């Protein structure tokens, strides 16, 4: 897989997980999240050549289609596969609330 380990190890231009720190206050304008102040959300980017972590047989057919016909601009796109959650702490006035937000962190990418 095009995971955190594969991608942060050998630095490749094609579809891979890229590091991305998102600060709730600065980057999103969300003053309400007490902990954490920010988190590595990461993201997916890079070209999807033929045979690179193809999601469906359509991703395989388009991979090959765009590899042979570069003018096509009908290529598979680099999107998350594996997504981890982020547990946050906030206060509704003086009341502490915890919310496990699903699919917050990108851990592996795929060509779809």
């Amino acid at each position, epitope marked *: 897989a095009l995971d955190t380990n594969y991608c942060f190890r050998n630095l490749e231009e094609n579809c891979c997980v890229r590091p991305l720190y998102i600060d709730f206050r600065q980057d999103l304008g969300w*003053k*309400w999240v007490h*902990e954490p102040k920010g988190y590595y959300a990461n993201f997916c980017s890079g070209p999807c050549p033929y045979l690179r972590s193809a999601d469906t047989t359509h991703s395989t057919v388009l991979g090959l289609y765009n590899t042979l016909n570069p003018e096509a601009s009908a290529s598979p796109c680099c999107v998350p596969q594996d997504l981890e959650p982020l*547990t946050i*702490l906030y206060y509704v006035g003086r*009341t502490p609330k915890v919310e496990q937000l699903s699919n917050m962190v990108v851990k592996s990418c795929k060509c779809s």
Partner: antibody
Framework: EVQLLESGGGVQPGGSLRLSCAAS????????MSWVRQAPGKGLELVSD??????????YYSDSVKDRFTISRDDSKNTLYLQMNSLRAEDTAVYYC??????????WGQGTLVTVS | DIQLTQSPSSLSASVGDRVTITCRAS??????????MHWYQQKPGKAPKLLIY???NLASGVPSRFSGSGSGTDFTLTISSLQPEDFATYYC?????????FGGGTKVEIKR
């Protein structure tokens, strides 16, 4: 940065005193504010709490000052007030003005002695 | 109304020593991964100063010698290498439910 500068302390029993707390160097407007008091020799006691506008300025008081003290706020000025009424002996303490964005009292003023005698 | 009991009520230690002091919470002050117990230092004629927030994280400008650990009902303040400046009354406070209460205070006197 942060500065929390409290004034107003110094009142005959059954009297009314008005504390002011000059806050500067932080997003005051979006954090909850409190008055914590320390009686000579005794420990720390949260006496009056007030939350931000984003939470309808909800307040809470320790049983000891309920229906007598009134905590107020001016977001334009960045000032915290405590309108103390029916003052009575055991209210003689240092009144610290403190900010808690979350659950910890991150910053404190150097206090104000209130002598009810 | 959570009752916080600090152990011990006082302590006489020598310069450079490894001090460990405790806070006893009547109820659990934790909500998920987060432990909502905080520690404050009060010097003779000064207002209390935050040292440790959320049981283990140290506050800005707090010396490396100050460490914290704890979960649910039992919390610990650790002074790794004591100093004559570390003379003060220390207080724990929870933020689990309103009203936020304070412990009694663990006085820390010096032996030179």
């Amino acid at each position: 940065e942060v500065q929390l500068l409290e004034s107003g302390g110094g009142v005959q029993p059954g009297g009314s005193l008005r504390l002011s707390c000059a806050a500067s160097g932080f997003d005051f407007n979006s954090y909850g504010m409190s008055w914590v008091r320390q009686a000579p020799g005794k420990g720390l006691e949260l006496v009056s709490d007030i939350v931000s506008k984003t939470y309808n300025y909800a307040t809470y008081y320790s049983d000891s000052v309920k229906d007598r003290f009134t905590i107020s706020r001016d977001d334009s000025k960045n000032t915290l007030y405590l309108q103390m009424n029916s003052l009575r002996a055991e209210d003689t303490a240092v009144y610290y003005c403190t900010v808690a964005p979350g659950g910890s009292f991150d910053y404190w003023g150097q206090g104000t002695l209130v002598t009810v005698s | 109304d959570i009752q916080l009991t600090q152990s011990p009520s006082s302590l006489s230690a020598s310069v450079g020593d490894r001090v460990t002091i405790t806070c006893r919470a009547s109820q659990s002050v934790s909500i998920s991964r987060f432990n909502l117990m905080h520690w404050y230092q009060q010097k003779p004629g000064k207002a209390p100063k935050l040292l440790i927030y959320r049981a283990s994280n140290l506050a800005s400008g707090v010396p490396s010698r100050f460490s914290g650990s704890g979960s649910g009902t039992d919390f610990t303040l650790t002074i790794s290498s004591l100093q004559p400046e570390d003379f003060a009354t220390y207080y724990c406070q929870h933020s689990r439910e309103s009203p936020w209460t304070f412990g009694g205070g663990t006085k820390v006197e010096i032996k030179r």
